[PDB]
Amino acid sequence: GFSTEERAAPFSLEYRVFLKNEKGQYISPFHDIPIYADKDVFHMVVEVPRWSNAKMEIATKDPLNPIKQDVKKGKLRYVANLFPYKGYIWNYGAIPQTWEDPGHNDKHTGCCGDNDPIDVCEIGSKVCARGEIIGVKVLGILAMIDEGETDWKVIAINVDDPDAANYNDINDVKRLKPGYLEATVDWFRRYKVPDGKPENEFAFNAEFKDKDFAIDIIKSTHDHWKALVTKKTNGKGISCMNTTLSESPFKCDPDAARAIVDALPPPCESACTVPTDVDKWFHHQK
Amino acid sequence: FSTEERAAPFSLEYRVFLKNEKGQYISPFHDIPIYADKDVFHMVVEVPRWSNAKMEIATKDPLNPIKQDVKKGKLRYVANLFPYKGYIWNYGAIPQTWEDPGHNDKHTGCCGDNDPIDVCEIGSKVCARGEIIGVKVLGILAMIDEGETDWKVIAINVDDPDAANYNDINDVKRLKPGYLEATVDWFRRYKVPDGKPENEFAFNAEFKDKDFAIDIIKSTHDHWKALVTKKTNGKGISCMNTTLSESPFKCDPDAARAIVDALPPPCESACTVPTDVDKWFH
């Protein structure tokens, strides 16, 4: 359904991954990819493949949401290998046309939105690619508190997984992939510890909520997103520019999108070398 | 040392041969001295940390190149045992060692598994297939595999920035907590995803210390010596080599080169690693 246009070399500061539809029009992965792929099937924008380390995400404040690599203190960011794990333990990404409005306090957690699309942890066997669009069955949700803010972690599976029919709610994950949900909480708890930050906290005693609860949350975030691109709520720095939303004042001609991408350095097929330190293991007393 | 690869990575005919600094082909089983330096063992790296292809020195092939294992007609890959990705250490062998079957271990009661001694290297750098490094030996684990004894040496790359901190098995326990527990877990459960059990250990699955390990290693080096001087029958082991003057099996450089040049030529693009390799096993 979709394709990728990459500017500059992977793992440089200039690297940008833009999205294209079937006709070759540049689109925002944040705004132009429909939340649903089919009945009961959500789209997922894949940001980081399982077992990779580069911290890539949809650029919420840059025109045309590209996916790009996070930076702190001037350095390209890579997540730790938290022993016994290698990098990211699932395919990781966002559900498009979702937004955690920072104006909205969540009732269950008491905190406000983090201003980002809702995050998804995809648990299937296939290792997906950066920028790939897939369809997923939602299974459950985790409520992490990320520095005072509500940060939902949706648990899901690629609808095209050979075993996908066996997974319909969160209990199937406990049953068919034991230790997995436990590892997920552990990972999100400790992932910033090697950066000299404390562990993260969770609502609901770091328990997972089921499918229906997850889908309720996702629906709300989609309604908040509706308000965003339709200009009935303060955008708050977010770039709403899009290429397909008829009902949006922020819609733009495909050639204006083209002008943005072309100002950027050309596609460089050869990735930069990932620093050697990234391969290090971070152990801890358990 | 450097590497000559033949054919396409992850095909049946893929082979990695070793060369010395002068470009002469050598056996990684027989021609690399057991010692890099005083108290420093050479290790032939077979398998990088986090990879799955089950590659090993071919004990029965001329010049003992590294190649991929084959069971039931299929190229072997180890499972991703959940929570792990592939092999959790760099994995390889100490050269000029041989577990002689027909030597029984006193502590174990089982006989040798007919291979060089195995090494789990625990440093931070991911090493490459075919790489020769130097390691400090720290301890040893004894796995019981089919009536045979199968030693697993614990070691660290002597060039690891932190190597000076590691002098015995307790240093691992203190500096890399969880590591040894995970090693036993891995060795216990790997190959449960294909077939059944395979989980037994001597010594109640404890790690013996450095001095115990070095005694075992020296022991297999002595048995290796007999092998290549033909004072013990290899029964199929290829002892061909190019540096051992005391060996009836020494051949000249051109002879080794002819053996290598008979394999398919080097190939750039790898073969496709099967997608089923990325599955997790819980």
PDB file of N, CA and C in Angstrom, chain B residues 101-154:
ATOM      1  N   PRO B 101      37.946 -39.098  22.673  1.00  0.00           N
ATOM      2  CA  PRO B 101      37.025 -40.106  23.216  1.00  0.00           C
ATOM      3  C   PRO B 101      37.882 -41.311  23.576  1.00  0.00           C
ATOM      4  N   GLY B 102      37.681 -41.937  24.719  1.00  0.00           N
ATOM      5  CA  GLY B 102      38.641 -42.957  25.110  1.00  0.00           C
ATOM      6  C   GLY B 102      39.662 -42.402  26.084  1.00  0.00           C
ATOM      7  N   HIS B 103      39.502 -41.128  26.417  1.00  0.00           N
ATOM      8  CA  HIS B 103      39.930 -40.615  27.703  1.00  0.00           C
ATOM      9  C   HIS B 103      38.607 -40.404  28.418  1.00  0.00           C
ATOM     10  N   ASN B 104      38.495 -40.892  29.647  1.00  0.00           N
ATOM     11  CA  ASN B 104      37.327 -40.586  30.462  1.00  0.00           C
ATOM     12  C   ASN B 104      37.734 -39.561  31.482  1.00  0.00           C
ATOM     13  N   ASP B 105      36.833 -38.646  31.804  1.00  0.00           N
ATOM     14  CA  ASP B 105      37.163 -37.671  32.822  1.00  0.00           C
ATOM     15  C   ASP B 105      36.898 -38.287  34.179  1.00  0.00           C
ATOM     16  N   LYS B 106      37.830 -38.057  35.095  1.00  0.00           N
ATOM     17  CA  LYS B 106      37.716 -38.548  36.456  1.00  0.00           C
ATOM     18  C   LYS B 106      36.517 -37.925  37.173  1.00  0.00           C
ATOM     19  N   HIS B 107      36.426 -36.597  37.131  1.00  0.00           N
ATOM     20  CA  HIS B 107      35.342 -35.876  37.802  1.00  0.00           C
ATOM     21  C   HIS B 107      33.977 -36.175  37.173  1.00  0.00           C
ATOM     22  N   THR B 108      33.976 -36.440  35.868  1.00  0.00           N
ATOM     23  CA  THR B 108      32.742 -36.567  35.093  1.00  0.00           C
ATOM     24  C   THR B 108      32.324 -38.023  34.861  1.00  0.00           C
ATOM     25  N   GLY B 109      33.302 -38.869  34.532  1.00  0.00           N
ATOM     26  CA  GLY B 109      33.053 -40.270  34.234  1.00  0.00           C
ATOM     27  C   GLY B 109      32.676 -40.528  32.783  1.00  0.00           C
ATOM     28  N   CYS B 110      32.526 -39.461  32.014  1.00  0.00           N
ATOM     29  CA  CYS B 110      32.213 -39.619  30.609  1.00  0.00           C
ATOM     30  C   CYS B 110      33.466 -39.442  29.779  1.00  0.00           C
ATOM     31  N   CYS B 111      33.366 -39.752  28.495  1.00  0.00           N
ATOM     32  CA  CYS B 111      34.516 -39.673  27.600  1.00  0.00           C
ATOM     33  C   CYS B 111      34.444 -38.411  26.736  1.00  0.00           C
ATOM     34  N   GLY B 112      35.527 -38.115  26.020  1.00  0.00           N
ATOM     35  CA  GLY B 112      35.602 -36.912  25.210  1.00  0.00           C
ATOM     36  C   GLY B 112      34.636 -36.926  24.042  1.00  0.00           C
ATOM     37  N   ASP B 113      34.186 -35.739  23.634  1.00  0.00           N
ATOM     38  CA  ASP B 113      33.226 -35.607  22.541  1.00  0.00           C
ATOM     39  C   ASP B 113      33.861 -35.481  21.167  1.00  0.00           C
ATOM     40  N   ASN B 114      35.184 -35.656  21.105  1.00  0.00           N
ATOM     41  CA  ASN B 114      35.918 -35.754  19.837  1.00  0.00           C
ATOM     42  C   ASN B 114      36.196 -34.406  19.160  1.00  0.00           C
ATOM     43  N   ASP B 115      35.886 -33.303  19.845  1.00  0.00           N
ATOM     44  CA  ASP B 115      36.057 -31.953  19.277  1.00  0.00           C
ATOM     45  C   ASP B 115      37.125 -31.145  20.019  1.00  0.00           C
ATOM     46  N   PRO B 116      37.556 -30.016  19.442  1.00  0.00           N
ATOM     47  CA  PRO B 116      38.337 -29.095  20.265  1.00  0.00           C
ATOM     48  C   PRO B 116      37.474 -28.541  21.396  1.00  0.00           C
ATOM     49  N   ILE B 117      38.114 -28.011  22.433  1.00  0.00           N
ATOM     50  CA  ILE B 117      37.368 -27.468  23.560  1.00  0.00           C
ATOM     51  C   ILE B 117      36.623 -26.163  23.179  1.00  0.00           C
ATOM     52  N   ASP B 118      35.355 -26.069  23.593  1.00  0.00           N
ATOM     53  CA  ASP B 118      34.485 -24.914  23.306  1.00  0.00           C
ATOM     54  C   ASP B 118      34.716 -23.721  24.253  1.00  0.00           C
ATOM     55  N   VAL B 119      34.578 -22.503  23.722  1.00  0.00           N
ATOM     56  CA  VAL B 119      34.803 -21.287  24.507  1.00  0.00           C
ATOM     57  C   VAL B 119      33.658 -20.295  24.351  1.00  0.00           C
ATOM     58  N   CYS B 120      33.141 -19.815  25.482  1.00  0.00           N
ATOM     59  CA  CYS B 120      32.183 -18.714  25.493  1.00  0.00           C
ATOM     60  C   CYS B 120      32.932 -17.434  25.880  1.00  0.00           C
ATOM     61  N   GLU B 121      33.107 -16.529  24.927  1.00  0.00           N
ATOM     62  CA  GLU B 121      33.803 -15.273  25.168  1.00  0.00           C
ATOM     63  C   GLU B 121      32.784 -14.173  25.535  1.00  0.00           C
ATOM     64  N   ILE B 122      32.984 -13.497  26.665  1.00  0.00           N
ATOM     65  CA  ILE B 122      31.942 -12.642  27.245  1.00  0.00           C
ATOM     66  C   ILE B 122      32.116 -11.113  27.121  1.00  0.00           C
ATOM     67  N   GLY B 123      33.156 -10.671  26.410  1.00  0.00           N
ATOM     68  CA  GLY B 123      33.452  -9.254  26.267  1.00  0.00           C
ATOM     69  C   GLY B 123      32.407  -8.476  25.486  1.00  0.00           C
ATOM     70  N   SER B 124      32.576  -7.160  25.376  1.00  0.00           N
ATOM     71  CA  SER B 124      31.541  -6.305  24.792  1.00  0.00           C
ATOM     72  C   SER B 124      31.552  -6.241  23.257  1.00  0.00           C
ATOM     73  N   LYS B 125      32.724  -6.355  22.647  1.00  0.00           N
ATOM     74  CA  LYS B 125      32.836  -6.347  21.193  1.00  0.00           C
ATOM     75  C   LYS B 125      32.225  -7.606  20.564  1.00  0.00           C
ATOM     76  N   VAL B 126      31.343  -7.414  19.597  1.00  0.00           N
ATOM     77  CA  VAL B 126      30.877  -8.538  18.791  1.00  0.00           C
ATOM     78  C   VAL B 126      31.958  -8.909  17.784  1.00  0.00           C
ATOM     79  N   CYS B 127      32.513 -10.110  17.904  1.00  0.00           N
ATOM     80  CA  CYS B 127      33.586 -10.542  17.004  1.00  0.00           C
ATOM     81  C   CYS B 127      33.043 -11.182  15.723  1.00  0.00           C
ATOM     82  N   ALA B 128      33.896 -11.359  14.712  1.00  0.00           N
ATOM     83  CA  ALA B 128      33.453 -11.935  13.431  1.00  0.00           C
ATOM     84  C   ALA B 128      33.831 -13.408  13.276  1.00  0.00           C
ATOM     85  N   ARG B 129      32.966 -14.152  12.605  1.00  0.00           N
ATOM     86  CA  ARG B 129      33.291 -15.495  12.136  1.00  0.00           C
ATOM     87  C   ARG B 129      34.667 -15.521  11.515  1.00  0.00           C
ATOM     88  N   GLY B 130      35.526 -16.385  12.041  1.00  0.00           N
ATOM     89  CA  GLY B 130      36.865 -16.541  11.511  1.00  0.00           C
ATOM     90  C   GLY B 130      37.915 -15.688  12.196  1.00  0.00           C
ATOM     91  N   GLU B 131      37.491 -14.760  13.056  1.00  0.00           N
ATOM     92  CA  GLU B 131      38.438 -13.891  13.748  1.00  0.00           C
ATOM     93  C   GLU B 131      39.287 -14.665  14.777  1.00  0.00           C
ATOM     94  N   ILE B 132      40.576 -14.362  14.841  1.00  0.00           N
ATOM     95  CA  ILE B 132      41.409 -14.935  15.894  1.00  0.00           C
ATOM     96  C   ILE B 132      41.707 -13.876  16.956  1.00  0.00           C
ATOM     97  N   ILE B 133      41.325 -14.176  18.188  1.00  0.00           N
ATOM     98  CA  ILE B 133      41.564 -13.264  19.301  1.00  0.00           C
ATOM     99  C   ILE B 133      42.366 -13.988  20.385  1.00  0.00           C
ATOM    100  N   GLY B 134      42.814 -13.229  21.389  1.00  0.00           N
ATOM    101  CA  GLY B 134      43.393 -13.781  22.600  1.00  0.00           C
ATOM    102  C   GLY B 134      42.434 -13.577  23.765  1.00  0.00           C
ATOM    103  N   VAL B 135      42.303 -14.591  24.619  1.00  0.00           N
ATOM    104  CA  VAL B 135      41.394 -14.516  25.754  1.00  0.00           C
ATOM    105  C   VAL B 135      42.041 -14.955  27.045  1.00  0.00           C
ATOM    106  N   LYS B 136      41.515 -14.416  28.147  1.00  0.00           N
ATOM    107  CA  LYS B 136      41.874 -14.894  29.475  1.00  0.00           C
ATOM    108  C   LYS B 136      40.793 -15.857  29.907  1.00  0.00           C
ATOM    109  N   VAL B 137      41.199 -17.029  30.378  1.00  0.00           N
ATOM    110  CA  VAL B 137      40.265 -18.038  30.836  1.00  0.00           C
ATOM    111  C   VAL B 137      39.889 -17.752  32.293  1.00  0.00           C
ATOM    112  N   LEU B 138      38.602 -17.895  32.603  1.00  0.00           N
ATOM    113  CA  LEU B 138      38.036 -17.471  33.863  1.00  0.00           C
ATOM    114  C   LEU B 138      37.401 -18.628  34.630  1.00  0.00           C
ATOM    115  N   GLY B 139      36.836 -19.589  33.903  1.00  0.00           N
ATOM    116  CA  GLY B 139      36.143 -20.701  34.509  1.00  0.00           C
ATOM    117  C   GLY B 139      35.640 -21.712  33.487  1.00  0.00           C
ATOM    118  N   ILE B 140      34.943 -22.728  33.966  1.00  0.00           N
ATOM    119  CA  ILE B 140      34.499 -23.780  33.070  1.00  0.00           C
ATOM    120  C   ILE B 140      33.220 -24.436  33.562  1.00  0.00           C
ATOM    121  N   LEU B 141      32.391 -24.852  32.616  1.00  0.00           N
ATOM    122  CA  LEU B 141      31.141 -25.527  32.899  1.00  0.00           C
ATOM    123  C   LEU B 141      31.220 -26.878  32.224  1.00  0.00           C
ATOM    124  N   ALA B 142      30.674 -27.909  32.853  1.00  0.00           N
ATOM    125  CA  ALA B 142      30.685 -29.242  32.236  1.00  0.00           C
ATOM    126  C   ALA B 142      29.293 -29.719  31.858  1.00  0.00           C
ATOM    127  N   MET B 143      28.989 -29.727  30.564  1.00  0.00           N
ATOM    128  CA  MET B 143      27.704 -30.236  30.090  1.00  0.00           C
ATOM    129  C   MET B 143      27.808 -31.716  29.736  1.00  0.00           C
ATOM    130  N   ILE B 144      26.808 -32.496  30.129  1.00  0.00           N
ATOM    131  CA  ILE B 144      26.759 -33.915  29.787  1.00  0.00           C
ATOM    132  C   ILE B 144      25.846 -34.121  28.598  1.00  0.00           C
ATOM    133  N   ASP B 145      26.447 -34.494  27.472  1.00  0.00           N
ATOM    134  CA  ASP B 145      25.780 -34.519  26.170  1.00  0.00           C
ATOM    135  C   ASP B 145      25.916 -35.910  25.535  1.00  0.00           C
ATOM    136  N   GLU B 146      24.935 -36.780  25.791  1.00  0.00           N
ATOM    137  CA  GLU B 146      24.814 -38.085  25.118  1.00  0.00           C
ATOM    138  C   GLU B 146      25.797 -39.167  25.581  1.00  0.00           C
ATOM    139  N   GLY B 147      26.227 -39.102  26.833  1.00  0.00           N
ATOM    140  CA  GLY B 147      27.196 -40.066  27.330  1.00  0.00           C
ATOM    141  C   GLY B 147      28.603 -39.497  27.246  1.00  0.00           C
ATOM    142  N   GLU B 148      28.718 -38.326  26.616  1.00  0.00           N
ATOM    143  CA  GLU B 148      30.006 -37.659  26.437  1.00  0.00           C
ATOM    144  C   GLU B 148      30.135 -36.394  27.305  1.00  0.00           C
ATOM    145  N   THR B 149      31.365 -36.018  27.633  1.00  0.00           N
ATOM    146  CA  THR B 149      31.576 -34.782  28.378  1.00  0.00           C
ATOM    147  C   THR B 149      31.805 -33.636  27.384  1.00  0.00           C
ATOM    148  N   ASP B 150      31.186 -32.486  27.640  1.00  0.00           N
ATOM    149  CA  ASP B 150      31.261 -31.333  26.737  1.00  0.00           C
ATOM    150  C   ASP B 150      31.572 -30.055  27.504  1.00  0.00           C
ATOM    151  N   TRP B 151      32.854 -29.747  27.638  1.00  0.00           N
ATOM    152  CA  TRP B 151      33.301 -28.587  28.398  1.00  0.00           C
ATOM    153  C   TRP B 151      32.958 -27.254  27.739  1.00  0.00           C
ATOM    154  N   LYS B 152      32.546 -26.292  28.566  1.00  0.00           N
ATOM    155  CA  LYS B 152      32.305 -24.932  28.100  1.00  0.00           C
ATOM    156  C   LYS B 152      33.160 -23.952  28.884  1.00  0.00           C
ATOM    157  N   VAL B 153      34.253 -23.527  28.256  1.00  0.00           N
ATOM    158  CA  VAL B 153      35.172 -22.561  28.830  1.00  0.00           C
ATOM    159  C   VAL B 153      34.595 -21.154  28.833  1.00  0.00           C
ATOM    160  N   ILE B 154      34.676 -20.474  29.982  1.00  0.00           N
ATOM    161  CA  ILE B 154      34.294 -19.063  30.089  1.00  0.00           C
ATOM    162  C   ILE B 154      35.534 -18.161  29.987  1.00  0.00           C
TER     163      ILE B 154
END
